[PDB]
Amino acid sequence: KVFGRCELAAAMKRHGLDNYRGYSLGNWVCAAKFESNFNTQATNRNTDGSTDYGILQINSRWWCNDGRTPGSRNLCNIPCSALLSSDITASVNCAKKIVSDGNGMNAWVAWRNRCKGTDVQAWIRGCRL
Ligand SMILES: [Cl-]
Ligand SMILES: [Cl-]
Ligand SMILES: [Cl-]
Ligand SMILES: [Cl-]
Ligand SMILES: [Cl-]
Ligand SMILES: [Cl-]
Ligand SMILES: [Cl-]
Ligand code: NA
User: Fold this and answer.
1) Distances (CA, A) of 86 to 55, 64, 72, 81, 119
2) 102, 111, 121, 122: least surrounded by Cβ within 10 Å?
3) Per the similarity annotation, which family is this?
């Protein structure tokens, strides 16, 4: 599924991400824009053979099981395929674990490089939320 901007903001708020660990909804929308372009089915292979999955490009090195990332963990206790669903529940639940891990949203390199410190409220501007 390719979400619209305000459609994703609304879904992230319905699943309790807005202001989660102090990160406003615009931070989450911005992260999803640059990680996946709002596409739930986005995948990207990393140089180390891990894969990033879904709207927030969650990595198999730590967070999900894809059977093909040697030495990896599955700390969200999910198949990485669950992160590609039209329903964002598994991505949101796992993202809450990641952003609790100690470095906040810096875990998302694209958030650090393209969202951190910017006018992230622009991402929810105009949205009926
Ligand atoms: Cl957009
Ligand atoms: Cl915001
Ligand atoms: Cl594996
Ligand atoms: Cl594990
Ligand atoms: Cl699995
Ligand atoms: Cl959803
Ligand atoms: Cl933080
Ligand atoms: Na894994």
Assistant:
1) 10, 17, 25, 11, 28
2) 102
3) Belongs to the glycosyl hydrolase 22 family.
Segments making up each domain of the chain, as ranges: 5-124
Pick the catalytic residue from 7, 18, 48, 52.
52
Reply yes or no on whether 18 is catalytic. Answer: no
Is residue 35 part of the annotated active site? The answer reads yes
- Elucidated via: X-ray
- Cα–Cα distance, 37 to 29 (Å, whole number): 10
Place of tokens 């650090």: 112
Whether residue 55 contacts residue 88, with contact meaning beta carbons closer than 8 Å, is answered with yes
Annotated binding site for substrate: 101
Cα(35) to centroid of ligand 2, in Å?
17
| 5-124: CATH topology | Lysozyme (1.10.530)
Pair 76, 93: CB distance under 8 Å: yes
